[PDB]
CSV table of C-alpha atoms and ligand atoms in Angstrom, one decimal:
chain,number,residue,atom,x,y,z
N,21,UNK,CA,148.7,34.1,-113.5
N,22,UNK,CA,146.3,35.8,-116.4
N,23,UNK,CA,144.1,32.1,-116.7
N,24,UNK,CA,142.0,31.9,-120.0
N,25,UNK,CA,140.0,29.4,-122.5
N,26,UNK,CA,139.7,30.3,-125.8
N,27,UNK,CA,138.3,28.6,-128.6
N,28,UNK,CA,139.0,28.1,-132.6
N,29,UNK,CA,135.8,27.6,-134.0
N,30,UNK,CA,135.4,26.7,-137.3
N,31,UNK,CA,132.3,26.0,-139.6
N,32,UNK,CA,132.1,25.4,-143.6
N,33,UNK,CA,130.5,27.8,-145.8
N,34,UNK,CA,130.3,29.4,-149.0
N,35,UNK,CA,132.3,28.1,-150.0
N,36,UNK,CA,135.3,28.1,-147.6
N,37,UNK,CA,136.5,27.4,-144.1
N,38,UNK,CA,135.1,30.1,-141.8
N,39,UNK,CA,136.4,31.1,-138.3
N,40,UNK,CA,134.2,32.4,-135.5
N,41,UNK,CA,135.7,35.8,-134.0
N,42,UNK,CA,134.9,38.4,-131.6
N,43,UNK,CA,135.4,42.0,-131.7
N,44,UNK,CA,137.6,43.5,-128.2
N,45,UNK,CA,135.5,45.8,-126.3
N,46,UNK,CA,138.9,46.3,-123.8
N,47,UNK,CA,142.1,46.8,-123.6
N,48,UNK,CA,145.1,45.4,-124.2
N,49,UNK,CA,145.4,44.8,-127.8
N,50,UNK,CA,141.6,47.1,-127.6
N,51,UNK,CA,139.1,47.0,-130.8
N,52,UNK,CA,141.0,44.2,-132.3
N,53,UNK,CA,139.6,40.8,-133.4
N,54,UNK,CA,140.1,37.5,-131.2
N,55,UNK,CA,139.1,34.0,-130.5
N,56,UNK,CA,135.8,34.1,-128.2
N,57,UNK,CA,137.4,33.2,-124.5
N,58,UNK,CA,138.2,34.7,-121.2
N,59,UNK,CA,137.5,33.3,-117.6
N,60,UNK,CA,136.4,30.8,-115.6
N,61,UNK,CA,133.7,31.5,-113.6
N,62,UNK,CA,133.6,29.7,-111.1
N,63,UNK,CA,129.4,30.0,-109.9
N,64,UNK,CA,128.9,28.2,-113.5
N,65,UNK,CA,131.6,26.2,-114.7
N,66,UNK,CA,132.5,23.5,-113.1
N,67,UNK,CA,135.3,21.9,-115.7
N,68,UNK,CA,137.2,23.6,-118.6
N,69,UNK,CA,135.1,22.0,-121.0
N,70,UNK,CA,131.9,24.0,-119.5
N,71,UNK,CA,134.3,27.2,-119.6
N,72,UNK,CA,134.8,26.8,-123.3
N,73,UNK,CA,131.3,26.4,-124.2
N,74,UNK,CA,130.0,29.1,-122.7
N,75,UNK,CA,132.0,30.9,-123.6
N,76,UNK,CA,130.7,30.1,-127.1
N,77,UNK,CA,127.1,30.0,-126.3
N,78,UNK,CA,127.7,33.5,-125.0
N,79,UNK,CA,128.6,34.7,-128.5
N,80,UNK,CA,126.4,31.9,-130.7
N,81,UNK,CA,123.5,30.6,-128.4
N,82,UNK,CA,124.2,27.2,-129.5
N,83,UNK,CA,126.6,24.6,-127.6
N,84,UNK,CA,128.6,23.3,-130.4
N,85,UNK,CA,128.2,19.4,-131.4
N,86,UNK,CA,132.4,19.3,-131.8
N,87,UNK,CA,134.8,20.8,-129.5
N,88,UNK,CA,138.7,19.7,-128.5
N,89,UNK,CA,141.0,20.6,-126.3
N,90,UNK,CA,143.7,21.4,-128.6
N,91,UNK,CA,147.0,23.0,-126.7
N,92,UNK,CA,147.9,25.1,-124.1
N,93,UNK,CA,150.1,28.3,-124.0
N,94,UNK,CA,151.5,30.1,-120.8
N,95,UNK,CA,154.7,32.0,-121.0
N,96,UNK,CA,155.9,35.9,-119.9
N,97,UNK,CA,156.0,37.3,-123.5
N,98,UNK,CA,152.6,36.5,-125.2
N,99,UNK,CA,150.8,39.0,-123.0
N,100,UNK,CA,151.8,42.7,-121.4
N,101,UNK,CA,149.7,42.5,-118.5
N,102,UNK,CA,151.4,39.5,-116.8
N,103,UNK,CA,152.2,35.9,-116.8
N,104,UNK,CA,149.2,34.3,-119.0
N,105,UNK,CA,148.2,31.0,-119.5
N,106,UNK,CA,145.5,30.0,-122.2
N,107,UNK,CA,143.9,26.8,-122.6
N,108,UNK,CA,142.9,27.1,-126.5
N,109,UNK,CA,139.9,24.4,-127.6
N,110,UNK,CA,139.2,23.5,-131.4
N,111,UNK,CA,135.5,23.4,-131.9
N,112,UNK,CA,133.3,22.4,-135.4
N,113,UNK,CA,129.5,23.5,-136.1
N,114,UNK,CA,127.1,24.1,-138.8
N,115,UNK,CA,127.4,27.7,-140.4
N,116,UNK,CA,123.0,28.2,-140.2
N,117,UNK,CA,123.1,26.8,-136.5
N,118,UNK,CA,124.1,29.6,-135.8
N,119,UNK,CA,124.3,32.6,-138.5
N,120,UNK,CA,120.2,32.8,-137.4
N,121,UNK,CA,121.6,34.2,-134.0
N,122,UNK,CA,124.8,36.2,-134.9
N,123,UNK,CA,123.6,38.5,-137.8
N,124,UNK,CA,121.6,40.9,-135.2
N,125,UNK,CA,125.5,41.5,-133.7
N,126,UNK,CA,128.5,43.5,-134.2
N,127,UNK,CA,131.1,42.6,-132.3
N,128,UNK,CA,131.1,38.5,-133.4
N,129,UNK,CA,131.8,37.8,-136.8
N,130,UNK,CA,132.3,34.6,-139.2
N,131,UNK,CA,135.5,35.3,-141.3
N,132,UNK,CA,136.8,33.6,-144.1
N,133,UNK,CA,139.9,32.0,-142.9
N,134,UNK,CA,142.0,33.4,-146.0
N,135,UNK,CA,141.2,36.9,-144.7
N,136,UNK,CA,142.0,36.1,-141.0
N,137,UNK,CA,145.4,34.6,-142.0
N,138,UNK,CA,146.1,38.2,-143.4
N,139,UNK,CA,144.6,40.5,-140.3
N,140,UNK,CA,146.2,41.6,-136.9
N,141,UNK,CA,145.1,39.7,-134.7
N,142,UNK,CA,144.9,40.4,-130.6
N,143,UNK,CA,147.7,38.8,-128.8
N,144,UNK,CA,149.0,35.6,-130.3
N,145,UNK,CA,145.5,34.3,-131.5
N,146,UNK,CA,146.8,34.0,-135.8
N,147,UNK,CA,149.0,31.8,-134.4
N,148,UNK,CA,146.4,29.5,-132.5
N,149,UNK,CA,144.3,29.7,-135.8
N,150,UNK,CA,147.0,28.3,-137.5
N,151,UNK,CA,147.7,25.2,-135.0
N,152,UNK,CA,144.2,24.7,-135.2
N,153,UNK,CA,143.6,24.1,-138.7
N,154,UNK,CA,146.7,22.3,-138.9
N,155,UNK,CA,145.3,19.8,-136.3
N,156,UNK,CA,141.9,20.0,-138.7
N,157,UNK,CA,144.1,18.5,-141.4
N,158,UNK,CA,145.1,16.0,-139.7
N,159,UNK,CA,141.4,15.3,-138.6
N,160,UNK,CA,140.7,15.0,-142.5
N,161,UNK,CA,143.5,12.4,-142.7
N,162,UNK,CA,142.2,9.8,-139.6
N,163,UNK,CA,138.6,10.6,-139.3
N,164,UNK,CA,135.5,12.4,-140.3
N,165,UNK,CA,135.5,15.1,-137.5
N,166,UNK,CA,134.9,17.6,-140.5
N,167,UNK,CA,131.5,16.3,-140.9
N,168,UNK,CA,130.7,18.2,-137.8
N,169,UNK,CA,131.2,21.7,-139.8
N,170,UNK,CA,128.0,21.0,-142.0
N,171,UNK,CA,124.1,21.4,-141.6
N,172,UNK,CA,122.4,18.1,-141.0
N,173,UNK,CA,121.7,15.9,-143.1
N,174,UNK,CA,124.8,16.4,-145.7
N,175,UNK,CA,125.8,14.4,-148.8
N,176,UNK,CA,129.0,12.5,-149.4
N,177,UNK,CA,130.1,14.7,-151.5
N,178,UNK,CA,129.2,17.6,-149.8
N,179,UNK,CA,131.4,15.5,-146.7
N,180,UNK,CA,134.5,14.7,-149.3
N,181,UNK,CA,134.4,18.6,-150.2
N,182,UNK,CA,135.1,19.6,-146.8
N,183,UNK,CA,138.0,17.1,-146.4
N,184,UNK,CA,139.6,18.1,-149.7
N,185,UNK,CA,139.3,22.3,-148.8
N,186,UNK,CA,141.2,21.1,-145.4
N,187,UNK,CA,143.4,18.9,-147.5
N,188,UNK,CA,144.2,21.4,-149.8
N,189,UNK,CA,144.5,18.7,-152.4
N,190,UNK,CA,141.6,17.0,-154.7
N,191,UNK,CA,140.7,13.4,-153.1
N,192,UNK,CA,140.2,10.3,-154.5
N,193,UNK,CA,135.9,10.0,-154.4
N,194,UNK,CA,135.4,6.2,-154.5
N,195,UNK,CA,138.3,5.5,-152.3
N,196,UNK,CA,136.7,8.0,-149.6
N,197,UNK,CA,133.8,6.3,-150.4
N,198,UNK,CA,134.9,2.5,-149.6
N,199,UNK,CA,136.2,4.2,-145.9
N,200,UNK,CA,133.4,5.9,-145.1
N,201,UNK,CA,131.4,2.5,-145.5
N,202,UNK,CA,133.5,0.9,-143.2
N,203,UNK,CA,133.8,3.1,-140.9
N,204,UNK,CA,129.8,2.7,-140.6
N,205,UNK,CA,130.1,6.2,-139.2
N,206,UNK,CA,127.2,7.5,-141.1
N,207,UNK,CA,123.8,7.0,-140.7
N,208,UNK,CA,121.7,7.0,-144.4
N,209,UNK,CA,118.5,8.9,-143.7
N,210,UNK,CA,117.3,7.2,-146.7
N,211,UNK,CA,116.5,10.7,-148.1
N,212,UNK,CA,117.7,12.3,-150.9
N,213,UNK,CA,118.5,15.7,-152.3
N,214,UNK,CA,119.3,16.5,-155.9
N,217,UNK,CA,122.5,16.5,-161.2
N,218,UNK,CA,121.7,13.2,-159.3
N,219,UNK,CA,119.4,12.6,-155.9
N,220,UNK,CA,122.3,12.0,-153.1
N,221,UNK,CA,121.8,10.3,-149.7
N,222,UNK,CA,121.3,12.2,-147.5
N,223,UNK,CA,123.8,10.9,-144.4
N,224,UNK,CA,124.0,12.0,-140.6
N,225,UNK,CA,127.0,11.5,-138.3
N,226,UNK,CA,126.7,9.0,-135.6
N,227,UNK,CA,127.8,10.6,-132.3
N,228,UNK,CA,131.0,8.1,-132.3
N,229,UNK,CA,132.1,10.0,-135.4
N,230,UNK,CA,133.9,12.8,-132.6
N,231,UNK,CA,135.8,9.7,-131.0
N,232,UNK,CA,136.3,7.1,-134.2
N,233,UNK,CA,139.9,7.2,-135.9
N,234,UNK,CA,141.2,5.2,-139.0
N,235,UNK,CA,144.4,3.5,-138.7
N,236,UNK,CA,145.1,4.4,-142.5
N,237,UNK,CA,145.3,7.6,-143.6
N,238,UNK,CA,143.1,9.1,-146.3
L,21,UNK,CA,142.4,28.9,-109.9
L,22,UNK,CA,145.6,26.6,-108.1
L,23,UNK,CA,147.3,26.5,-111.3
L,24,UNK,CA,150.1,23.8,-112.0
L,25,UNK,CA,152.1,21.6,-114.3
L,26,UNK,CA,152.9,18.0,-114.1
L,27,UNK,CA,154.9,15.5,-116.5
L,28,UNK,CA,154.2,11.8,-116.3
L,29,UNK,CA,157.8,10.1,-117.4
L,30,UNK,CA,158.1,7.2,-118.7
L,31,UNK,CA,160.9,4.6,-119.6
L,32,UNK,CA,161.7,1.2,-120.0
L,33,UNK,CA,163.7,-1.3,-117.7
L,34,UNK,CA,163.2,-4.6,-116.9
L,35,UNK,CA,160.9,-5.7,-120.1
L,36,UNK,CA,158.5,-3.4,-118.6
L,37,UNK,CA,157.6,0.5,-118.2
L,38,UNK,CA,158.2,2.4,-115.4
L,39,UNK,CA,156.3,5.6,-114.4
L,40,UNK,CA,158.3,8.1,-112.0
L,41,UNK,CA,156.5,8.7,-108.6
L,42,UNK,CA,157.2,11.5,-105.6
L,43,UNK,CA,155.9,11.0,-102.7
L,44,UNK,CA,154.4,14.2,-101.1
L,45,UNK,CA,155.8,16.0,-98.0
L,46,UNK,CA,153.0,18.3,-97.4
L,47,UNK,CA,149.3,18.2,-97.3
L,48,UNK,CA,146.9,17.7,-98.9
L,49,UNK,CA,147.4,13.8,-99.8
L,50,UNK,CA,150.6,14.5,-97.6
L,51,UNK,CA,152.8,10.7,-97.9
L,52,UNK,CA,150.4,9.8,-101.0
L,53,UNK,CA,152.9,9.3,-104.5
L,54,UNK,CA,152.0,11.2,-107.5
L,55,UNK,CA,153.6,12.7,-110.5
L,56,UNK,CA,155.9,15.4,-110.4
L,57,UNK,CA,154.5,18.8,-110.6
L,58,UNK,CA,154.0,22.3,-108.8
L,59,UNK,CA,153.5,26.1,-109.5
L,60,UNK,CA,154.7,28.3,-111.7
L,61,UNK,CA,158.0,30.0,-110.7
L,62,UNK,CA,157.8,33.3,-112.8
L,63,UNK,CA,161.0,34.5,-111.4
L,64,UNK,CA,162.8,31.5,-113.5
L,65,UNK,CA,160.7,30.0,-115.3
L,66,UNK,CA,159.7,32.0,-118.8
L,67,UNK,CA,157.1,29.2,-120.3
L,68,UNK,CA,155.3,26.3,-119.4
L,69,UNK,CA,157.8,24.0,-120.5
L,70,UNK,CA,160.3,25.8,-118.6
L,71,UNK,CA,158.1,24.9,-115.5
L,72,UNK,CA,157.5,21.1,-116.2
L,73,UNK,CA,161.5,20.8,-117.0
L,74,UNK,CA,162.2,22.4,-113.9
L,75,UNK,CA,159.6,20.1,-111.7
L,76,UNK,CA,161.2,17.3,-113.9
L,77,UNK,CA,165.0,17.8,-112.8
L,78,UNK,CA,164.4,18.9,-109.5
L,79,UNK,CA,163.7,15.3,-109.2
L,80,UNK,CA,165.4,13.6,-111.8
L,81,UNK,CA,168.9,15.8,-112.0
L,82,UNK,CA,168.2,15.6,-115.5
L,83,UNK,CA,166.4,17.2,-118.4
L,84,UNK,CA,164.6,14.1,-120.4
L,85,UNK,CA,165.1,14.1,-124.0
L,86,UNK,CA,161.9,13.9,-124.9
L,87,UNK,CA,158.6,15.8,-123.6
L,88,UNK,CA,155.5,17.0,-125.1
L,89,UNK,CA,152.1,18.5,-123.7
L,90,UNK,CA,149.5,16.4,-123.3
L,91,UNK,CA,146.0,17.8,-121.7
L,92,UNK,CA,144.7,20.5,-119.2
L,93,UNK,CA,142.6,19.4,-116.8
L,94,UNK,CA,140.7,21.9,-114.5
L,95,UNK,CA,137.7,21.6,-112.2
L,96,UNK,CA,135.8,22.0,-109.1
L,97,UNK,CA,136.4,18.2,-108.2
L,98,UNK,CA,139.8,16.6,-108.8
L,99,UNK,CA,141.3,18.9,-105.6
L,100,UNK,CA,138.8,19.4,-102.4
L,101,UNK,CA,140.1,22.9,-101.7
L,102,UNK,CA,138.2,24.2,-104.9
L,103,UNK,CA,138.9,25.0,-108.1
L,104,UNK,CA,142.2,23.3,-110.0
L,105,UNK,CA,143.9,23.8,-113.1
L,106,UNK,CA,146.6,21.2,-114.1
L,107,UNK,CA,148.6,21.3,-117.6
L,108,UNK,CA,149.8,18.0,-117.6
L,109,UNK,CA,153.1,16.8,-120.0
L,110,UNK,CA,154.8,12.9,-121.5
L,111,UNK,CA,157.9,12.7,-120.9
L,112,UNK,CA,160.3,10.1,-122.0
L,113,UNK,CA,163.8,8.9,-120.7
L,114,UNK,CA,166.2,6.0,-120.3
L,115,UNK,CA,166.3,3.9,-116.8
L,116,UNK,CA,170.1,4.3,-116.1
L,117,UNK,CA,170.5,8.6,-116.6
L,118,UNK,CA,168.9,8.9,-113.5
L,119,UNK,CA,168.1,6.0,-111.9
L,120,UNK,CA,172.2,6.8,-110.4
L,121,UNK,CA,170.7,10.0,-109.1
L,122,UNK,CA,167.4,8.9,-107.5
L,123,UNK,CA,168.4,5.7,-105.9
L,124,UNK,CA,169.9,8.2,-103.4
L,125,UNK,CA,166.5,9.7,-102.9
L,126,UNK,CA,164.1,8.9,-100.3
L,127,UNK,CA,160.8,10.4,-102.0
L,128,UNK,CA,161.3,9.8,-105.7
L,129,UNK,CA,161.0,6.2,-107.4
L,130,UNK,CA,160.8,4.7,-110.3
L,131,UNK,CA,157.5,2.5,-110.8
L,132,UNK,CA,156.0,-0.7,-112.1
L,133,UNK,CA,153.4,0.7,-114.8
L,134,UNK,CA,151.3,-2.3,-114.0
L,135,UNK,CA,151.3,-1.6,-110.0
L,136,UNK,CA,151.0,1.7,-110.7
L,137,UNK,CA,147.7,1.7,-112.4
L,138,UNK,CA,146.3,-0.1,-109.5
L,139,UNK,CA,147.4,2.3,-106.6
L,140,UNK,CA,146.0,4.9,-104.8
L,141,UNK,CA,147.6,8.2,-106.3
L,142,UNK,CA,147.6,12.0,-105.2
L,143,UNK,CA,143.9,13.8,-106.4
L,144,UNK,CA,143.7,12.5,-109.9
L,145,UNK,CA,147.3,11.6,-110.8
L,146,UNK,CA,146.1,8.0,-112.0
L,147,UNK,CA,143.6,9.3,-114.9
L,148,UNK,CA,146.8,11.1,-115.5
L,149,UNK,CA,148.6,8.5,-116.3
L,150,UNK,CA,146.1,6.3,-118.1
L,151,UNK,CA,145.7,8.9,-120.7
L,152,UNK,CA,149.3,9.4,-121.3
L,153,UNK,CA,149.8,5.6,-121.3
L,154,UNK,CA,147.0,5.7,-124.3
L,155,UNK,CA,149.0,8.9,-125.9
L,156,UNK,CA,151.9,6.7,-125.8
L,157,UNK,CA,150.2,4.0,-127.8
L,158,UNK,CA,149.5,6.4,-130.5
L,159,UNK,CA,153.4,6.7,-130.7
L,160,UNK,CA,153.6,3.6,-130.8
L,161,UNK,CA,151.2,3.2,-133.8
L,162,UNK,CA,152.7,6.5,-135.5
L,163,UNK,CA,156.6,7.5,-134.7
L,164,UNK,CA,160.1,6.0,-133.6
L,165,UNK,CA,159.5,8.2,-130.2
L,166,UNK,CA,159.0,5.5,-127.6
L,167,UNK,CA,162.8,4.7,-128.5
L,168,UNK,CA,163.4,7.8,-126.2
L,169,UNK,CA,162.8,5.5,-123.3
L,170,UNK,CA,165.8,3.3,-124.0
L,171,UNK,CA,169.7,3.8,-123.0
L,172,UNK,CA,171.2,5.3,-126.0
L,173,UNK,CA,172.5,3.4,-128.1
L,174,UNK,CA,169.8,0.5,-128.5
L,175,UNK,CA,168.9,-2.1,-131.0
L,176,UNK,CA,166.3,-2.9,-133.2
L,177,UNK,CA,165.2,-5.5,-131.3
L,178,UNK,CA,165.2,-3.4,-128.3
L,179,UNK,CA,163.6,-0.7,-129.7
L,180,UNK,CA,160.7,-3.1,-131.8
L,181,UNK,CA,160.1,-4.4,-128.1
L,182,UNK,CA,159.1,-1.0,-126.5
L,183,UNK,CA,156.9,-0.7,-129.2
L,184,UNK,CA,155.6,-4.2,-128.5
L,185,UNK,CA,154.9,-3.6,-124.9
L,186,UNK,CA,153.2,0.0,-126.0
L,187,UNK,CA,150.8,-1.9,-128.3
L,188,UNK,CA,150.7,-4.7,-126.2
L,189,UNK,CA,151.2,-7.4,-128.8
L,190,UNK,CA,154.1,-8.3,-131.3
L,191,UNK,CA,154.6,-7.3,-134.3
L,192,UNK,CA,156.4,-7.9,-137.8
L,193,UNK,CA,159.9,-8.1,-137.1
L,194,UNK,CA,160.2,-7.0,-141.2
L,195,UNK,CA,157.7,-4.2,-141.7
L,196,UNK,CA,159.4,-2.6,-138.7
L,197,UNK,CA,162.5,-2.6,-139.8
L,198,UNK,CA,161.9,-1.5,-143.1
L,199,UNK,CA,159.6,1.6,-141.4
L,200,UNK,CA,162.1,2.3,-139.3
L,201,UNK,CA,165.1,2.2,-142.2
L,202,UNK,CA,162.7,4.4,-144.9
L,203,UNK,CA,161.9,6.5,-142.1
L,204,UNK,CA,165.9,7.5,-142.0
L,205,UNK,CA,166.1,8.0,-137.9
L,206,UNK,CA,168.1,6.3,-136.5
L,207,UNK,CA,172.0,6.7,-136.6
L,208,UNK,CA,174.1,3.5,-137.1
L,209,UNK,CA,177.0,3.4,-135.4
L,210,UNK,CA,178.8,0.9,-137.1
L,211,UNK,CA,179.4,-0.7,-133.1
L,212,UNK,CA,177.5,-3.6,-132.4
L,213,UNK,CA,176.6,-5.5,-129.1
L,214,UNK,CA,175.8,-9.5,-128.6
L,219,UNK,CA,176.4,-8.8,-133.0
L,220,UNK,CA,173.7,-6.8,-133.2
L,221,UNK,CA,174.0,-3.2,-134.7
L,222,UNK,CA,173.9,-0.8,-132.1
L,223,UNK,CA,172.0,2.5,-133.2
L,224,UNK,CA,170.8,6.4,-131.6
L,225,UNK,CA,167.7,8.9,-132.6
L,226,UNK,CA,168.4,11.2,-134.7
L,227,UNK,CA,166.8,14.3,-132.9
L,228,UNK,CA,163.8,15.2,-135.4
L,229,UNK,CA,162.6,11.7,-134.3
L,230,UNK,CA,160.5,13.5,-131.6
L,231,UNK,CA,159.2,15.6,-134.8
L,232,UNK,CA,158.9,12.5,-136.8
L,233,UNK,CA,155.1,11.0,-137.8
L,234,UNK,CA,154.4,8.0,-139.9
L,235,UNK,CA,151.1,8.6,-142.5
L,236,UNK,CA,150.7,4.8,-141.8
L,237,UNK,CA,150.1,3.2,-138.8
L,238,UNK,CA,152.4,0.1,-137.6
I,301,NA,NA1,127.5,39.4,-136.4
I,302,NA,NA1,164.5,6.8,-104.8
């Protein structure tokens, strides 16, 4: 079997959900845009997980601070060369992290998500767009995963934006507010940045693991 | 890359789980047991769920009403040949739809759960397990699906206990049952057994999530 990683990742700005995509230099589905992915290599890699970012760092030259497995799809119909199976990973960074070593290239791309949903996109990639920013809605719901899409440090309400774009749906700021405290998944940097001067807040590394029980 | 599916199955006999075991006729880990699972047949098998149903009844007789996906795992460690890709799948079924079929069968068994996490298992079948053991929690905390491991029909008790075992402590015998009858799954059918009301999934209970957790 065809064997692939690919990843969906996302970042926030400008004020809208971004998705990281890469130009195809070959054929099948040739010159169209993708999700960065493609094979193990087996002299470097030695789990999926070290596939996947690589395969990023190859495009960004950053590793990510977010990345999930989030599905994979093998079947006989998805790809005209063969049999393919693709191991497809969710992954969150800042926009900046980044956009300082993607500008000087032509073949990757951030692309507002709006205009992705409407282009054609190489084999059945839309389609794992759209699982995983489903599955980011749900992250938006039980944690504070989209945290991981902003520059460092961030405000709350820089934070709560994020949520509600993923939400689709205004969110209720002081109730938000009253989880975030609990969740003690923040860490106040005791700065501030300005109408008002707004802590400025870090994620704690078990921010990618921690889930409320509630939902937002 | 070895490239293969498994399914971890589970149901529920005895007041306890049961995990479904083969034990292995060739090598490596030749006589160890661990989870059904093999290659890719793409001369019948047109998806990956097509392969893990297949691996599942080849062993079972029978097509489990419930499955879903639940990691890849793939590296240069878990199989001593080299480099191994596994999609691994939950399944869910009752005891008695096949236990009739594999009773007759040397080198398939239903498990204790409980025994099970303590044995030595074929390359890493056992992390396998433990994380769809925790995946099954989650269901547990979020949808009516662990009643997919009980001969249909069931009863509320019956099913509230599953879920009890899942979470591993009781729960509210009154905010379950008023999930579970807002939630609008479960078919009554107007039979009852000692007189408890005897009930079966509707089928988008695999589809299903609560917003709340139990
Ligand atoms: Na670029
Ligand atoms: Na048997």
């Amino acid at each position: 079997q065809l064997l692939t990683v690919d990843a969906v990742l996302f970042t926030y700005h400008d004020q809208q959900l971004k998705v990281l995509l890469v130009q195809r230099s070959n054929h099948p589905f040739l010159g169209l845009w993708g999700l960065p992915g493609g094979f193990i290599d087996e002299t470097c890699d030695e789990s999926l997980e070290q596939t996947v970012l690589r395969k990023l760092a190859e495009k960004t030259a950053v590793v990510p601070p977010y990345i999930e497995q989030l599905c994979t799809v093998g079947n006989n119909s998805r790809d005209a060369r063969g049999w393919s199976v693709t191991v497809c990973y969710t992954a969150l960074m800042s926009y900046q992290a980044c956009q300082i070593q993607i500008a000087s290239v032509s073949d990757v791309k951030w692309w507002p998500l709006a205009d992705v949903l409407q282009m054609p996109l190489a084999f059945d990639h839309l389609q794992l767009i759209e699982q995983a920013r489903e599955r980011l809605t749900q992250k938006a719901l039980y944690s504070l995963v989209p945290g991981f899409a902003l520059s460092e440090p961030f405000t709350l309400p820089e934070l709560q934006h994020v949520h509600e774009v993923l939400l689709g749906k205004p969110i209720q700021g002081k109730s938000f507010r009253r989880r975030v405290e609990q969740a003690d998944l923040l860490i106040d940097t005791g700065l501030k940045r300005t109408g008002r001067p707004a802590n400025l807040y870090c994620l704690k590394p078990d921010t990618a693991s921690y889930r409320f029980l509630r939902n937002l």
